[PDB]
Amino acid sequence: MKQAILYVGHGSRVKKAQQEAAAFLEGCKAHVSAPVQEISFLELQEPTIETGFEACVKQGATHIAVVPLLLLTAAHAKHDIPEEIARAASRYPSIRISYGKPIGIDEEVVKAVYHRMKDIARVVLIGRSSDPDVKRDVTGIANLLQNMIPVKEVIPCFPNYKEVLSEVTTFVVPYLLFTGMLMNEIEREVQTLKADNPNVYLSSYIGFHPHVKNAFLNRVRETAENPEGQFDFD
Ligand SMILES: [Co+2]
Ligand SMILES: [Co+2]
């Protein structure tokens, strides 16, 4: 037996984001017991999932745990990544594959939100959607945050955040792993809003806070352990 982890990030055009994601995934390697560990990206960034999967096989992996670096379960986790993995599986039929879940609702991510907020009551949680599983997840996370600290309310916007801002101290927490255009838009809209309401405060994005890392590594470990084959990928 020789276990591999294939990490799958979203990928990005933005230099800083490429750096944050690649340093983050390289940092994870020292925290995971598997002898073969490879990084790949769904879009824009090298290596691709194809190359990453191939890199694991080259290194003699018998088993590959594919773990998506995503905060939520929607099209990427449910459709795009597994269809790219199935191409790989057809190329390498004797590899046993397991496939993990996005972070989702995990009290560790809530701890990251607290920490980002503590770098500065209601909370406005801004993130990425038509998929209902995203509605469930973000509502879940808002309810955990709402009860883990003494805030008045938490309002997810996954509702157009622009309009929620147009409508008591308010924290705006971007529920995003990395920076980019959306983050630049939010930064701009809050910036303008501050002139109209001075009790609005924008935190940095959750990013790769150590509590996010904890949450991710819990995903990695359950996927690689694959209890009762529940993470088996066909
Ligand atoms: Co995307
Ligand atoms: Co399809």
Side-chain angles (χ1 to χ4, degrees), residues 1-12 14 16-83 85-86 88-90 92-134 136-159 161 164-165 169-187 189-190 192-195 197-224 226-227 229-233:
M1 159 139 201
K2 182 166 183 182
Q3 181 65 236
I5 310 300
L6 179 58
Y7 299 105
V8 183
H10 184 288
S12 171
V14 182
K16 186 182 161 183
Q18 298 182 335
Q19 286 175 321
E20 283 171 314
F24 173 71
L25 293 170
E26 273 284 304
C28 292
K29 287 185 186 170
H31 289 249
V32 169
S33 69
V36 177
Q37 298 186 53
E38 298 295 319
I39 276 169
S40 60
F41 297 96
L42 179 60
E43 202 113 47
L44 292 172
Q45 249 183 272
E46 278 167 342
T48 56
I49 294 162
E50 173 177 359
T51 310
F53 198 100
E54 170 186 310
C56 296
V57 178
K58 286 177 185 183
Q59 290 174 70
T62 56
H63 290 68
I64 303 190
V66 180
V67 183
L69 183 59
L70 300 172
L71 282 163
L72 302 160
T73 315
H76 296 331
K78 292 194 264 185
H79 175 268
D80 310 324
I81 294 161
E83 286 185 6
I85 303 302
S90 76
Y92 302 105
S94 56
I95 294 279
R96 264 87 169 151
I97 305 165
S98 54
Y99 175 48
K101 286 199 280 258
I103 292 147
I105 314 171
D106 190 311
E107 54 132 46
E108 287 295 308
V109 302
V110 182
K111 290 185 198 148
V113 172
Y114 161 72
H115 275 287
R116 311 260 80 140
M117 283 170 72
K118 200 71 195 309
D119 299 345
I120 336 169
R122 87 166 67 78
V123 172
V124 167
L125 219 61
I126 306 193
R128 308 288 182 188
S129 172
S130 45
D131 200 309
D133 291 357
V134 165
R136 179 252 277 121
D137 286 3
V138 65
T139 302
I141 286 137
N143 291 324
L144 294 181
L145 179 68
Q146 197 180 157
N147 286 287
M148 291 187 27
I149 26 170
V151 301
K152 190 162 142 288
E153 68 192 313
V154 184
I155 304 182
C157 301
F158 284 67
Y161 86 88
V164 181
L165 301 205
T169 301
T170 296
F171 293 81
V172 183
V173 178
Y175 200 70
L176 297 181
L177 289 177
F178 46 81
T179 198
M181 299 196 100
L182 181 54
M183 186 60 201
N184 296 331
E185 200 184 47
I186 294 167
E187 196 174 307
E189 305 264 81
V190 173
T192 61
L193 165 59
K194 279 196 90 79
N197 178 358
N199 309 302
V200 66
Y201 297 92
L202 167 71
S203 86
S204 186
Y205 43 97
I206 59 174
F208 299 113
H209 194 278
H211 288 285
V212 175
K213 190 170 184 162
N214 292 347
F216 187 55
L217 286 179
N218 295 323
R219 298 305 189 199
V220 170
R221 286 186 194 103
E222 69 177 358
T223 306
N226 192 17
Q230 69 196 234
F231 292 101
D232 283 358
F233 178 92

